Design a protein around this ligand. Structure first.
Ligand code: NA
Ligand code: NA
Ligand code: NA
Lengths: 251, 251, 251, 251, 251, 251
């Protein structure tokens, strides 16, 4: 029935699309697609929800990755088999630097590889670096909408707790090599934690594919406030506008 | 609001459940729950679909993990915060040993850690070993229903493609350290590949939680046939019967 | 003269034995063999003392390994060349968990690989896991004699000091990566330290051989008492009875 | 006496300079400085030759690093202590990709860390990534002068010979882990080999300093010609023009 | 009771000895001691047989280590607690270089660390280097008795079989990282394989103790002959003469 | 023009020299050469300044290496291609042990490999050990001039700051794995820090070349005094006299 093992998609479903916008949450896919022209639901299998839309007369696919490098690596590989050559990740994120504020935009140049899947594509010495054209388009798009933008390194963790040094957990334990790790990243100028960029960027950079990542800040762990639903929604829309505007320049 | 960050659940949702059956696919959760009494949909957030049911008068939770260690680690942590102390994984898998046949059942004693998330809980030297009571219950459940059972080691990979040495891919490339790795695992008596057990077993064994894993064989890489959809579903149902029967003896 | 390089044994010496009981101390071999029928000294070369005996009419070999993975690996390989397929380690051990008491029995499901020899058989990601049939027989045997039994993970160290974080030593120094390591293992639920299981279990699990391990607790490092010779002898005999009873079910 | 241990410079020597152009060869520093206004020799200590010049009315420093990460790390640290916040490396290089031609220009987004000094600033997981403003300035400068430009990843090696898989050597030997490594990098889209960028980029990105790198192609390993001395000098001058032009936009 | 946990010795047993000759085989200790004055049996516990003797009027101890780093580490620590500051290892070995002949003598300057126990004392970067006074004494002793001597590096392996690339074994398997390793060592000028020097040398060099090692060649892997038992014994005696003569100059 | 890529030397320039004295500083080369007969400047390219001189009627080359393993590895390789088989490093160094005084001489038996270039010749397990004949000649030469000599291990770092745990720096930061590292080395008996020996010794020991290293102590970090220029010059000359005297015995 399907041309790929997981996504439940055919080559025909994409209608010639060579660019994908890849959020983490399957529920965010519809919201992104409906910003563009003629949006249509393609398929929903497991954590992979896909919509097609049109941007300046060209087909674009929006496809969820799920949380983490493993599911991300499946989505990227199978979209590549369906003709996608450019991948733009859109997210919402915390920040770990005092100068980054809620509502700010982060463009990731490269990731600290605290994942496992990146290693299935390149050894650790290989940089988890974003594509220059993608990063440039994201920076320009953020500037065009008047965003407060920070450009730099993101720590990409296979866990959303220990790996991000969270202690309000079931065991309250963080393994030795991750204990004190957040302070290390902070001292090295790392902007934030997320969970997919190390895999996404390493995979694409070693596979002849283009990848970039943008994210809107919803919380800062050095000045931690409970996020407001109104502000989070606005920040999400702000970041989505940027990723779509960047995509217009990468078609 | 929910009591946890990702699962969209409250403590009350579980109604006292301390055991979880944890498949990968959100769309497979309902079918497992309906083997038991009073199956009820709890939540569907991102790749995490959860249903409550009753087994021998005791509340049990069935919750999907999504694909890979990262999302699995989130599901296990948040279920633990909601009172789950026992985790049984059920899946379907491809075998890498000639003596294992399609329709056979695999009980995993421990995993080869080809993931990243396990390292966030214990250093590599720590064994990704299953809980003995869980393993025993699974073995007993398998032999009680007349299964052909293999007990042993599973290779647990952060990728579906290069980490399992698949070459029919976009790039056709497999990185040096994974090239020839399948033959290595075969030579050491490893039964199969899957994508979540290294994280699940390492996390639970180091956090005072009990975990086990069972899987039905749908393909054998050494004598590779295209699986019949009917046979796949039958083997899936067979493995699900075993995981539920095992759960009865762990309550 | 001999069929093997180290053990000083011939195929004929074993009289068809396919199961070995493997203690560490050459002096313990006679005591174990004499619990069974028709015991006879076979050979004593270096740290390798071997006796043959009969269990339910079947020949069984008891052979010392010496201290550590290297000598253990030699004993296992050369016994395998002499037809041994099942190896049961019997020991006396300390414990590092408050709930484990002197006189209790520990059955090891898998080992933390703090050795070097295991790596000569499999990379670190491979689990140092015991054979399920062997572990099952040991657990059943312990239950049959009314033992207080703990089942779980053992830390297996190439040293009996630094690697076990002992400071009352010549230098009083423990290298950085082992400093604070005991607390790490304790927090992860590890039962005890010993010095051979990482090699034994990794080697057997990767070589198509069956291995299990049982040990009697003589000291607890969280509530450390000087052991009494009377109690140590009783605990040794208690554990030996278990390993022989388990062996009866694995012939 | 000097204000620093190796460079033989005082704070006053820089006359307010906060940007450095950092070539490898001490004997190449003068030629770069004389592109700009009022070029003056500052010091020549060991492999560190430094000249001051003025670019658009702002003092700039040109300082050699010597060959390799170790001497580079000294130059960067001591220049930082003297007020330098931006570091632009200029070099000439051999390409390892068929599409890259002699006379082409390479802008490095990030480096494969085949060095040792980068590890003294950040663990291997940290990306050896260039500063985005620096990279942008270099790309813009390259296209402004009509260069044929390639943007991407560079392999940065602690050796000229075995680490770059050269076999026409004294021993003719290349150690196992580097044997076949060039093919690996080529398969991942790595552009070229050089010897300083892993250290330079990792150090700067983790120390709150900005760094970029540009290089002129003098040979291609896949279509290897003996370079013409005239062409080498012309390509060198072309790359130097680009680094200086980029510097104008970073002041 | 004894003053140490394993050796079964008291401080008084050594009668002031501060130098130990440490062979592997317990059954070889007596023969070494009887080269010297008033040889007396001290203890035989597990693989640790110890004899006292007098050399030029000074008490010396000969104590077996057993096979491998783990038991060696125990013997060295406990002898150190009993006042031993100098450790000289004597063994017999197989060479891996064409120019080294049966009956030749090898003095080890340092070891390739293919063991686990050395890591319990120093990280891998630390050299497994012999004490210069010990090495000098051994070299001088060798040339004083008309030996054909080779001075250099020894590969020290935690296994006799796979770690030394032996394939005539039960499984016939050698794990990937050790497959082809012998050729690697040969290419780097490594003289031979043995099983204890990495632990012995690393431990002593990091604990303020002096260590050296000498061995007689009984076989050459590149020109492999079955050793004659007479020749083996003669070469053993020759090496023992050298270790004792060296000891005279270290008192 | 030149027979090698970097040094700017021909085979004829060396006039049959097979021994090189290799200081770090290009400015020190003239001073060393002029201690011998008929000194002549050969070439000066980048950090590589070379002089030829005559010692007991035999040609010897003095050639600078620059700072660090990478430039050292180039100098050693290209000198080897020009017929040099013996390399003697001469330096001035700090010390990290309380018993070592300013003006003392250090002879290095082996290095702690805190570099990157050594790995391009041998894996980490391989010892960075000096040649016995070279070390012997240096020790004898130091004794002949009445030096206070310490013989042992040197920590060889790719950086002159962080890697040597210096905090009076631009960032004041030392990466986690180097934080507290100096105390570790001190506790293990390491004499001093320098920056070239790990590469030099590993490279030579694995390439069939002979290498030794001697250095004069100018500062002690446990009792840190500002060095006097008079004393530093005397110590430099003292060490140079030793390296030349040692060279006389290695021709
Ligand atoms: Na997922
Ligand atoms: Na240099
Ligand atoms: Na032993």
């Amino acid at each position: 029935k399907s041309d790929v093992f997981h996504l439940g998609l055919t080559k025909n479903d994409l209608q010639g699309a060579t660019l994908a916008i890849v959020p983490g949450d399957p529920q965010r896919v519809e919201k992104i697609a409906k910003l563009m022209d003629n949006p249509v639901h393609l398929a929903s299998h497991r954590e992979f929800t896909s919509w097609r839309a049109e941007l300046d007369g060209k087909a674009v696919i929006v496809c969820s990755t799920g949380i983490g490098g493993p599911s991300t690596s499946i989505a990227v590989e199978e979209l590549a088999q369906l003709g996608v050559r450019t991948f733009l990740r859109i997210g919402t994120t915390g920040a770990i630097q005092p100068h980054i504020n809620v509502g700010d935009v982060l463009v990731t140049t490269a990731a600290v590889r605290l994942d496992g899947a990146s290693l299935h594509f390149a050894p650790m010495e290989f940089p988890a670096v974003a594509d220059f054209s993608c990063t440039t388009a994201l920076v320009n798009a953020a500037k065009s909408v008047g965003a407060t933008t920070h450009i730099g390194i993101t720590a990409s963790s296979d866990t959303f707790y220990p790996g991000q040094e969270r202690y309000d957990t079931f065991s309250g334990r963080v393994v030795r090599h991750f204990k004190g790790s957040m302070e290390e990243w902070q001292s090295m100028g790392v902007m934030n934690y997320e969970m997919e960029s190390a895999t996404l960027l390493t995979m694409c950079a070693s596979q002849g594919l283009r990848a970039g990542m943008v994210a809107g800040v919803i919380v800062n762990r050095t000045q931690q406030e409970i996020p407001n639903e109104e502000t989070m929604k606005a920040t999400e829309s702000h970041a989505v506008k940027i990723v779509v505007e960047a995509a217009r320049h990468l078609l």
